[PDB]
Amino acid sequence: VDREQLVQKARLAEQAERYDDMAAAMKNVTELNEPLSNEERNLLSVAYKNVVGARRSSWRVISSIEQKTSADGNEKKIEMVRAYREKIEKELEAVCQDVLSLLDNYLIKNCSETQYESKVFYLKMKGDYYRYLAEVATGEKRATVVESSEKAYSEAHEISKEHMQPTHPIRLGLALNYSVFYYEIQNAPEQACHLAKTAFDDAIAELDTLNEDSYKDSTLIMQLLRDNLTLWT
Amino acid sequence: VDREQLVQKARLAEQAERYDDMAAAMKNVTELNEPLSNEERNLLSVAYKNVVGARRSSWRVISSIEQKTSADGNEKKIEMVRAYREKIEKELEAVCQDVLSLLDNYLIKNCSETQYESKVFYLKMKGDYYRYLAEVATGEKRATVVESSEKAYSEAHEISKEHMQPTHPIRLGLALNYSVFYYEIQNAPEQACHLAKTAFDDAIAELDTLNEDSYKDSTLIMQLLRDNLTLWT
Amino acid sequence: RAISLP
Amino acid sequence: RAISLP
């Protein structure tokens, strides 16, 4: 059982656009109960992002059609579109639960006090995947996953504020996603704008704290913050 | 579930980009042992084209990487890149065998003498899916599937020459794929060129015979014939 | 229509 | 390089 082969597998699977294989390899790496390098973290994130991403994209297409045919008033067709939506939801939720279990029982658990970058990165993932659950949940189940999403982002934001520079890509990326959560999930546009503007402004104030290694990644997330802000206003 | 529901599932799956579900739906439709409408044929074809397409694309990426690392001389890495290629091959081969079985046992079988369009369409698919098998085969296995592909295209070509106008999309599409077969598989560039040039010239000679329902598909293919011709010369 | 981290 | 029917 060779950790380096599993990582190489993941790199191969990514190149061949086989994201299930990539997720499986990186899951297996995580299960070895040893910390992930930066490259390994991203390999895990990219893998599950695509696996869940294809279901999210399918669910939107299906929901969108469900709306139109629901209005059209043809049951037999409506039942089948709805059943298909449910089938995709179950897939999506299974992927989210899979990631969350890795996060809670391996990745967040094994972060030491000083591994701030990793804690924020993982807590942000935890917020993201509960947010993906929130996108498709209704009733009490929605309320629960929304609370969980909020608690993950909230904690990640505390750690980021205290221990990372305003221009740090991971901190910026969290502000980005957390603000999206505020707008789309909590329907709190004021809170969303405040977070995105603050994060953007704070990065700009300390713009000289950019290393050439982070310049490109930070400035690009900053554009996204601004893009969202322009849209929301 | 009714035939009508399976077809609607196929249409939904297509919009959701879930080509496995699309193939499974259309497979069930085929197994009802009744002829396929025009829309149904295309649904079946688009479905499997994407399913196999994703493997062909992955195979090329992996094969290309195998050649570069093969030159590199690291056995551990070579073995697993090799094994990964083989895993994808098996998937691709299973998809082709699945389609071919549908074609031989249901679709071609159920074509009456006057259903020329259908026969050509299906025999072209048969040629295509043996061609895809030929892409990854070596030795005697390659020779066998190449013979099979040639046989299918050849028959389709005789029927299309005899029963379809030179401007007919299905006839043009066959000339396109058959000429690709000559070039890429048979390594017979003169035969490839002759077929593509003849088909294009014949369509131009009788270009007045385009119908408002087909001009679009037909003209698109004519471009592609010319594109290939330009490249091959 | 808001965009999250790619 | 050669393009088959889309």
Side-chain angles (χ1 to χ4, degrees), chain B residues 206-210 214-215 217-221:
Chain B
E206 284 181 69
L207 205 59
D208 57 289
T209 67
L210 288 168
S214 98
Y215 83 95
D217 290 346
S218 301
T219 56
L220 296 171
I221 298 163

Side-chain angles (χ1 to χ4, degrees), chain A residues 16 18 21 58 80 84 91, chain B residues 16 18 21 58 84 91:
Chain A
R18 287 175 62 98
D21 290 346
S58 294
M80 100 89 220
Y84 198 49
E91 278 175 26
Chain B
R18 292 177 56 102
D21 292 344
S58 297
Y84 202 52
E91 290 181 2

Side-chain angles (χ1 to χ4, degrees), chain A residues 5 8-9 12-13 15-16 18 21 55 57-58 61-62 65 80-81 84 87-88 91, chain B residues 5 9 13 15-18 21 54-55 58 61-62 65 80-81 84 87-88 91:
Chain A
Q5 277 229 345
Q8 275 165 346
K9 226 312 133 41
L12 266 185
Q15 267 157 305
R18 287 175 62 98
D21 290 346
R55 276 93 190 150
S57 157
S58 294
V61 169
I62 304 322
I65 288 158
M80 100 89 220
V81 182
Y84 198 49
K87 151 189 205 61
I88 289 151
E91 278 175 26
Chain B
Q5 260 68 58
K9 185 172 303 137
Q15 270 145 119
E17 290 175 80
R18 292 177 56 102
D21 292 344
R55 274 85 194 161
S58 297
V61 164
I62 299 304
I65 287 176
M80 86 92 185
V81 173
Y84 202 52
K87 161 195 182 63
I88 291 151
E91 290 181 2

Side-chain angles (χ1 to χ4, degrees), chain A residues 18 44-46 67 78 88 99 102 119 125 143 150 166 173-174 186 222 229:
Chain A
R18 287 175 62 98
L44 180 85
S45 184
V46 159
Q67 288 289 145
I78 301 162
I88 289 151
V99 188
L102 279 181
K119 256 192 180 147
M125 275 186 76
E150 164 73 22
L174 168 72
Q186 285 300 58
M222 278 160 70
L229 259 196

Side-chain angles (χ1 to χ4, degrees), chain A residues 54-67 69:
Chain A
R55 276 93 190 150
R56 288 170 73 221
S57 157
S58 294
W59 184 93
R60 295 191 293 265
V61 169
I62 304 322
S63 295
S64 177
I65 288 158
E66 187 276 326
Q67 288 289 145
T69 75

